[PDB]
Design a protein around this ligand. Structure first.
Ligand code: ENM
Length: 245
């Protein structure tokens, strides 16, 4: 039986709300405030999800939180892209049921260019006819797609987990055609990284000037952004690509 897929379906988070007031006129401050609130809620869900993944708990405890925090942006971009595809056919960005970005919001959020890349990703789910199961497997693999260049505390086990998740993805594909499909999916996975990078830069810059634009940022998010994001931006932590960029 599809044991692995059963597990991924079983732990997949349900709907997560942003808590946005859609009765108020759109503003940079209100939109980013709601995105940050959504972020805090999504991080809680991602931690619970990751810890329930096959073999994840065998990683050193410190490596567990590190990989979750390094891969989070990518995971969220990919998941949001899928939500946009399944709910509004990639027409708009479905951050949450109560936070759907139309073109006006993409502009007002001052995150237009990033939104364009995220919507493009959403469109690929349609162009490549990505199945819900391929989505689940790829998303799980994204958790193991970005690490410190100098390695994790137990880098050896991480390598083993990543290998096994790649094998499961190849598995669903097999369940010349397979070769072409694996190529397409790994190319799609690689495309998430540059998008996450743009968002890492944006969120970092926003934190540094949050006091001037009235964003605030919840205490926990500010800590993660100030400690982990710069490691990525400075090159100490790098994404793992399938293909040479
Ligand atoms: C990830 C979100 C929410 C979920 C979603 O559907 C996609 C969306 C993409 C944009 C993110 C937005 C959250 C709020 C952001 C970014 C906040 O980044 C926090 C953060 C950044 C990290 F690199 C690691 C972490 F664990 C947490 C804001 O601070 C600026 C950009 C915002």
């Amino acid at each position: 039986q599809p044991i692995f897929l059963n597990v991924l379906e079983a732990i997949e988070p349900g709907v997560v709300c942003a808590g946005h007031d859609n009765n108020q006129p759109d503003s940079f401050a209100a939109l980013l405030s709601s995105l940050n609130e959504l972020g805090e809620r999504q991080l809680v869900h991602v931690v619970k999800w990751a810890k329930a993944l096959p073999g994840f708990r065998n990683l050193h405890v410190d490596d567990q939180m590190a990989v979750i925090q390094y891969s989070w942006m990518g995971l969220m971009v990919f998941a949001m892209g899928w939500r946009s595809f399944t709910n509004v056919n990639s027409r708009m960005l479905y951050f949450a049921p109560d936070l759907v970005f139309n073109e006006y919001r993409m502009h007002k959020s001052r995150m237009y260019s990033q939104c364009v890349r995220m919507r493009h990703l959403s469109q690929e789910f349609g162009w490549l006819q990505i199945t819900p199961q391929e989505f689940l497997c790829m998303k799980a693999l994204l958790l193991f797609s970005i690490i410190p260049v100098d390695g994790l505390k137990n880098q050896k086990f991480f390598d083993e987990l990543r290998m096994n998740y790649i094998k499961e993805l190849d598995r669903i594909i097999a369940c010349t055609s397979c070769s072409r499909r694996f190529y397409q999916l790994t190319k799609l996975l690689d495309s998430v990284q540059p998008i996450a990078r743009e968002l890492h830069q944006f969120t970092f810059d926003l934190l540094i000037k949050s006091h001037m634009v009235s964003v605030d940022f919840p205490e926990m998010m500010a800590e993660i952004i100030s400690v982990q994001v710069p490691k990525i931006l400075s090159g100490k932590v790098k994404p793992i690509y399938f293909h040479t960029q």
